[PDB]
């Protein structure tokens, strides 16, 4: 299914951001060694400089690629959950908005946006009220383990780091020094 | 109950609004009889002129007021047998909702703002793909006799009856000329 792919695809991503900002702190810490230390390897250093510079980006990109796989498990979970509920309930739900949604079928794209809007203001409150019980809620037991496993949210720490934005220009820069970094054999 | 009471108000505004337009008809009919007659009784006439004017206020007032009755009656019933179904349901609904609302008595305004809106439009997907089913809905058991017996709406006669406005002050005149029109003893 999706939902298993989508898992995969996040947990694969965020795997990647932490990568990458492994390799940024192995950068910088030769930066620092170098720095550190009493030669003078003015070319070693420049490299390093805008390896660093790229590592930077680059954990930029992942960390944004990471939160948004993230979301997307959450969000086709809820989709999917909520549809195997308006399969057993949905005639009971409906049932209850008959007053509203009575002849939705029948009825035109204005009295259809109508219709739903201010059904969708009932059910917003009826949810507030079942809310304020303070019951608390856990996942979906068919989705548990995944959802758990990613997480509630992204760590913040990736917001921070995908934080800065890039135009496509330097994206574009950047994908490639990223792609010529890939190639280096170490020597 | 607060439905059955909003329930015995609406047919009762319902009948009312009836009767101030059979009391119009009445009233036009004898006009009409009057001018097509030989005589000519300027002062009933004038008389006549105004109790016609007031009676389409009347019809008017009643009809708002009817509309809005019932919309009452479908407004609680919505809300109670939604509530019930909360009651019923509502674990798996928010269990289902759960990477949007875990942790919701927790959140500050904005977070449940936030978590609200995009529930509520995950709510909305799902009811309507339930909807495209095209799978007829029918009144909640507990309610059906009550709102079919008040109709899905009134009838657009009193939504043609009520499209005029009046001015707070001209209400006022004829609020005064109703009650005149109330005591009058008929001689």
Known sequence: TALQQAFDTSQNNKAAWLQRKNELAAAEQEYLRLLSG??????????????????????????????????????????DRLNDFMQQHGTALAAALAPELMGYSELTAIARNSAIQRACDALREALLSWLAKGEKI?????????LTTIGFRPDVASVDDSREKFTPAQNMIFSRKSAQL?????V
């Open 138 to 146: 856990n996942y979906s037991a068919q989705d548990s383990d995944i």
């Open 38 to 79: 009493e030669g003078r390897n003015v070319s070693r250093l420049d490299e390093l400089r805008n390896i660093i510079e790229v590592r930077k980006w680059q954990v930029n990109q992942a960390a944004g690629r990471y939160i948004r796989s993230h979301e997307a498990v959450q969000h086709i979970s809820i989709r």
């Open 182 to 186: 890939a190639s280096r054999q170490s």
